[PDB]
Design a protein around this ligand. Sequence first.
Ligand SMILES: [Mg+2]
Ligand SMILES: [Mg+2]
Ligand SMILES: [Mg+2]
Ligand SMILES: [Mg+2]
Ligand SMILES: [Mg+2]
Ligand SMILES: [Mg+2]
Ligand SMILES: [Mg+2]
Ligand SMILES: [Mg+2]
Ligand SMILES: [Mg+2]
Ligand SMILES: [Mg+2]
Ligand SMILES: [Mg+2]
Ligand SMILES: [Mg+2]
Ligand SMILES: [Mg+2]
Ligand SMILES: [Mg+2]
Ligand SMILES: [Mg+2]
Ligand SMILES: [Mg+2]
Ligand SMILES: [Mg+2]
Ligand SMILES: [Mg+2]
Ligand SMILES: [Mg+2]
Ligand SMILES: [Mg+2]
Ligand SMILES: [Mg+2]
Ligand SMILES: [Mg+2]
Ligand SMILES: [Mg+2]
Ligand SMILES: [Mg+2]
Ligand SMILES: [Mg+2]
Ligand SMILES: [Mg+2]
Ligand SMILES: [Mg+2]
Ligand SMILES: [Mg+2]
Ligand SMILES: [Mg+2]
Ligand SMILES: [Mg+2]
Ligand SMILES: [Mg+2]
Ligand SMILES: [Mg+2]
Ligand SMILES: [Mg+2]
Ligand SMILES: [Mg+2]
Ligand SMILES: [Mg+2]
Ligand SMILES: [Mg+2]
Ligand SMILES: [Mg+2]
Ligand SMILES: [Mg+2]
Ligand SMILES: [Mg+2]
Ligand SMILES: [Zn+2]
Lengths: 237, 151, 138, 208
Amino acid sequence: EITVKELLEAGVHFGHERKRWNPKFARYIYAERNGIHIIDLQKTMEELERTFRFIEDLAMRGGTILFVGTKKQAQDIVRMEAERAGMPYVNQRWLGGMLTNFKTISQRVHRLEELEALFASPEIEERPKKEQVRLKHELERLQKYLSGFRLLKRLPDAIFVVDPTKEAIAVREARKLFIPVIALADTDSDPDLVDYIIPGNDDAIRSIQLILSRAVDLIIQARGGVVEPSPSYALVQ
Amino acid sequence: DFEEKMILIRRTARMQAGGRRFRFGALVVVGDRQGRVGLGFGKAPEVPLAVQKAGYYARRNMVEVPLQNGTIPHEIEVEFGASKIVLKPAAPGTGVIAGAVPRAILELAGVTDILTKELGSRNPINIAYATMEALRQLRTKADVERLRKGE
Amino acid sequence: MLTDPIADMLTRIRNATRVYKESTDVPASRFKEEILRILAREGFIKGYERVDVDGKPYLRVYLKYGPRRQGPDPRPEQVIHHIRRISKPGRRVYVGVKEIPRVRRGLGIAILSTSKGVLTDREARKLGVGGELICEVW
Amino acid sequence: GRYIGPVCRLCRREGVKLYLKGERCYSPKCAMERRPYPPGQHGQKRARRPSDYAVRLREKQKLRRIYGISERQFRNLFEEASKKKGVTGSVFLGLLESRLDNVVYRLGFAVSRRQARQLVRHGHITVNGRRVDLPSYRVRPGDEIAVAEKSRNLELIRQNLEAMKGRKVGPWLSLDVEGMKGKFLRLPDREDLALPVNEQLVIEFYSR
RNA sequence: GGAGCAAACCGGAUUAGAUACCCGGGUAGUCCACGCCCUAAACGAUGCGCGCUAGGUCUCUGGGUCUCCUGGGGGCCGAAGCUA
RNA sequence: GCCGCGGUAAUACGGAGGGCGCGAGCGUUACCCGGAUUCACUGGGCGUAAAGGGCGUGUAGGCGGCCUGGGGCGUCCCAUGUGA
Ligand SMILES: [Mg+2]
Ligand SMILES: [Mg+2]
Ligand SMILES: [Mg+2]
Ligand SMILES: [Mg+2]
Ligand SMILES: [Mg+2]
Ligand SMILES: [Mg+2]
Ligand SMILES: [Mg+2]
Ligand SMILES: [Mg+2]
Ligand SMILES: [Mg+2]
Ligand SMILES: [Mg+2]
Ligand SMILES: [Mg+2]
Ligand SMILES: [Mg+2]
Ligand SMILES: [Mg+2]
Ligand SMILES: [Mg+2]
Ligand SMILES: [Mg+2]
Ligand SMILES: [Mg+2]
Ligand SMILES: [Mg+2]
Ligand SMILES: [Mg+2]
Ligand SMILES: [Mg+2]
Ligand SMILES: [Mg+2]
Ligand SMILES: [Mg+2]
Ligand SMILES: [Mg+2]
Ligand SMILES: [Mg+2]
Ligand SMILES: [Mg+2]
Ligand SMILES: [Mg+2]
Ligand SMILES: [Mg+2]
Ligand SMILES: [Mg+2]
Ligand SMILES: [Mg+2]
Ligand SMILES: [Mg+2]
Ligand SMILES: [Mg+2]
Ligand SMILES: [Mg+2]
Ligand SMILES: [Mg+2]
Ligand SMILES: [Mg+2]
Ligand SMILES: [Mg+2]
Ligand SMILES: [Mg+2]
Ligand SMILES: [Mg+2]
Ligand SMILES: [Mg+2]
Ligand SMILES: [Mg+2]
Ligand SMILES: [Mg+2]
Ligand SMILES: [Zn+2]
């Protein structure tokens, strides 16, 4: 569902950053109780609704969302939430021009489906073992970086970010491309440059997961058939 | 449909062991005379490539040139770097009064009659980039009031 | 010290809008309000309430801004693009009904104090007066 | 005084027919249907991208060379025209056409402007019934341009007027072919006559 | 007044030369008082006073209900903005 | 005129052919305004490009905070004369 209680959000899912902040978390900040800045969970909702409202309005009209999360705290959680939504993602090091230069970056996804469908083909042993290994090594390279980018043979209509700061690069072109920006960002990064914000702990899996996990449920409820709460509470904490 | 027109070309020069290499600069202006112009600067190892990629960039940049009958809505001026340009609106029958740089931009945007001067730095490149901002900052009586109604 | 209060306010405003904020205050003045009185009625701003700051009477001035644009620099357009003082204390500028300005071929406004109160580039011409030309805004 | 000598060469210096000749500059060529290129040893050679100046210089010479009028008398008009208000550019050609030697060329009394001058000059032309031997004469609404009696003959006039049958006059003129009389009805807007000349380029050339 | 130092000066070296750099001597001067001189890369190469426009960290010095907040200073990185 | 042309292939010297520009004129020199926004009232500068006085104190001078009243000098409107 799209509904979300303020109880399970009670773990760390509201500001974990302090003074390492951007002073533009004005509206999105409650108090500085004990070092860390705590985020007014109340406004989150309103920002959420406004955000989800666009997520469904876009998901229910057959769009595509690109997920970016290089962070290790929210690294794999994107892989399972992106694959569980059939949508593209960036689990590894985000490359420059992946959008503004998407045209040429794509050509390098195109090396992969030539390498991909040549692992079982006939003309394989014909090429000396000296030449092989490396190729599959290369193939492994491509997959590592392009697994969640392998799909989506065109620029998305919006992008979801685990943190606009860690990835400002990613928003910058996207933003240069008029592409709308959704993201979860703790007091670290500055809003404004964000179109639809998820004002909360962009670190600490507990918080992150909680969001995306359901969040992606709302993405499925855009076509119909929301099932099991996708992978999660694994070795969570 | 679009009318290309480069108003500046030059040969820079870098230097390396034994001799000096050259790139080429291309300043091209694009428009339609409807009220839509674009400006792009293209560098390339040779002449054409630049010119060609100038129009490429020049089409990536455009403008809402509001024309109150071959002129502009209000009196505007804009300072870019050390260079300054003056656009004062003129009544029909006057013509475009400006250097060979700015006129080339006003034409491709229509503009039947206007008064202008270049102040400070006369460097075309900076005059160019200075002129677009001017236009990119024009507001018709309509664009204005909208704001002065609020909510 | 404040060798010029009016200018201070104009600048007090100019410096707020540049950074985008909801309201900045400014020391109370009969003449100061009659000036803001123009900006409200001309929609250059919202309004203001004779607020108080520690016994000292100020004027919380409320600013309007265009719609949140998108792309690089989502910061909105300015409702008040430009504002500068004309008749300063170091040089007073006095003009007659025939020597009145012409801000942006109508697109702007001009504020001047006359023997018939605080008027506008227009009203001055309508009333048929003239006096100290305060500033210009657009 | 006025220009004298090679003119078909101009016909092709600007790269456009301008019918300064009678039949010829109007027959198969101003010597151009033969050679549509610029005079001088460097004719059959490619040209260099004409500068914004040379363009306005050329587009100007074109117009002045058309009415075959000195740079003197010429600019005097533009200034007088520019002095006015409205558009000036349009007003300009207005003062150009108002010339006496001009009206005559249009009213078919002569084939060429240079032939039209000889007429006015020698005194074989009239205006409201006056001997006007001055090609500089400016004409207004309703002015009658006919031939004088001493001249209402001449084997050259009948030919010119005769050829004028099977031909029309400007929306600002009217000829009594059979009587030798014509009238200046109004000042012909830019529309009333189309030309290889963009005035606006001539306006620019004068704001050096 | 004069220990140390040290323009000028003398001697030893180096060098083609070495009126220098290096070594050994050495006078004014460097020190005090009184009276002059009034210059300088006298520099932050940034005149003085007042108001307005994010913050982060280090340090000196106050005041407080003393994790902190608050005032006056002294550095660094930096919002917006200015700048060739 | 400025930038610069001439060193045995000079569209830059000298002549020729040809072309461009004007025409009883076409050139030159000199002088004034323009461009020069390059004295900047309109309409500029002073960290490193020329430019903050070596630093204070202070004279005259310029400038001056919130409310209310008299005066109405400046300022503003109208009217009239004069501005041949
Ligand atoms: Mg660029
Ligand atoms: Mg500047
Ligand atoms: Mg300059
Ligand atoms: Mg220049
Ligand atoms: Mg006119
Ligand atoms: Mg001129
Ligand atoms: Mg010695
Ligand atoms: Mg020796
Ligand atoms: Mg010897
Ligand atoms: Mg010694
Ligand atoms: Mg010693
Ligand atoms: Mg002595
Ligand atoms: Mg200072
Ligand atoms: Mg203490
Ligand atoms: Mg401090
Ligand atoms: Mg800094
Ligand atoms: Mg910046
Ligand atoms: Mg030779
Ligand atoms: Mg040579
Ligand atoms: Mg020469
Ligand atoms: Mg020669
Ligand atoms: Mg010749
Ligand atoms: Mg020649
Ligand atoms: Mg002369
Ligand atoms: Mg002039
Ligand atoms: Mg000044
Ligand atoms: Mg200057
Ligand atoms: Mg200063
Ligand atoms: Mg120096
Ligand atoms: Mg200096
Ligand atoms: Mg100093
Ligand atoms: Mg001083
Ligand atoms: Mg001194
Ligand atoms: Mg001093
Ligand atoms: Mg005093
Ligand atoms: Mg005083
Ligand atoms: Mg006072
Ligand atoms: Mg009083
Ligand atoms: Mg009078
Ligand atoms: Zn011909």
